[PDB]
Amino acid sequence: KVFGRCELAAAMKRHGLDNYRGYSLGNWVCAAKFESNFNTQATNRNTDGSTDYGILQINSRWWCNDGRTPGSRNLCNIPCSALLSSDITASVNCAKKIVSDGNGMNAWVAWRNRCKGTDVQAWIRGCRL
């Protein structure tokens, strides 16, 4: 599913991401925009052989099992394919673990490089939450 901006903001709010670990909703919407272009089906291979999955581009080396990443730790205890669903629940639940891991949203390179320090409130402007 390709989400609209406000549609995704509303879904993320319903799933408890607004101000989760102190990160306002706009941060999450911005991260999703630049990680996946709001497409739940996005996948991208990495040089290390791992793959990133779904709207928040969660990695198979640490977080989910894709059956082809040797030594994967599967810390979210889910198949990576679950992260490609139109229902964002599994992605959100896993993202909450990632952001709690010590480095906050710096875990997402696109967030660090494209969202951090910017006016992230713009990403939810106009939306009826």
Name the minimum Å distance from CB 18 to Cl ion.
15
d(CA 71, CA 93): 22
Assess whether 7 carries a catalytic annotation. no
Q: What is the DSSP pairing of strand 43-45 with strand 58-59? A: unpaired
Which of helix, strand or coil describes residue 27? helix
Binding partner at 104 among Co ion, Cl ion, none, C-beta below 5 to 8 Å by kind? Cl ion
- Report whether 101 belongs to an annotated binding site: yes
Name the minimum Å distance from CB 23 to Cl ion.
7
Q: Under a CB-based contact definition with an 8 Å cutoff, are residues 66 and 79 in contact?
A: yes
Q: Which residues of this chain interact with Cl ion, rule CB under 5 A?
A: 104
| Smaller CB separation from Co ion, 30 or 124 | 30
Q: Which residues are annotated as a binding site for substrate?
A: 101
